[PDB]
Amino acid sequence: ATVKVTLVKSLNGRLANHKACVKGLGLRRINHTVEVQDTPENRGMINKAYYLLRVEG
C-alpha cells in the first residue's frame, strides 16, 4: 500500500541522479518523512538512493 521513507543523510555532493531520486519522492530535509505508494516505479527511486534513506516499511 504505502511505505515510510526518511532522509537520514545530507544531499550535498551527491550525484545529480541521486539528488533527483530523493527529490522525486518528495523528500527535502534531513529527518523529513513522506508516505509514498508502493509502486514498482517508486521502489526504483528508493533502491537507487538506498544509502541516503531509511525505509520503515
Partner RNA sequence: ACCAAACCGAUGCAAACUCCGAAUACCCAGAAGUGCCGAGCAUGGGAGACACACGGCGGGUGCUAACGUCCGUCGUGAAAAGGGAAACAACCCAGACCGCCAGCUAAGGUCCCAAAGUUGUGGUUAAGUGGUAAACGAUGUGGGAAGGCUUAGACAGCUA
Partner RNA sequence: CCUAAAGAGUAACGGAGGAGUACGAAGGUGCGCUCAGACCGGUCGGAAAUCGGUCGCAGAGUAUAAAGGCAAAAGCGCGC
Partner RNA sequence: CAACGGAUAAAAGGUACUCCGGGGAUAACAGGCUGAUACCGCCCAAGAGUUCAUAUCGACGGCGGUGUUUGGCACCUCGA
Partner RNA sequence: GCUUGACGAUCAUAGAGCGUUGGAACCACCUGAUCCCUUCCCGAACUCAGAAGUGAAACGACGCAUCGCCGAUGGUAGUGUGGGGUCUCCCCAUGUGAGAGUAGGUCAUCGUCAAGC
Q: Which of 1, 3, 4, 36 binds RNA (CB under 7 A)?
A: 36
Q: Residues 31, 7: contact at Cβ < 8 Å?
A: yes
- Measured distance CA(34)–CA(23) in Å, rounded: 11
Tell me the closest approach of the beta carbon of residue 54 to RNA, in angstroms: 12
- Give the nearer residue to Mg ion in terms of CB position, either 13 or 57: 13
Q: Which of 23, 33, 54, 55 binds RNA (CB under 7 A)?
A: 23
What's the Rg (C-alpha) of the chain? 10
CA atoms within a 13 Å half-sphere pointing along the CA-CB vector of 13: 2
Residues that bind RNA (CB under 7 A): 9-18, 23-26, 29-30, 36-37, 39, 41-42, 45, 51
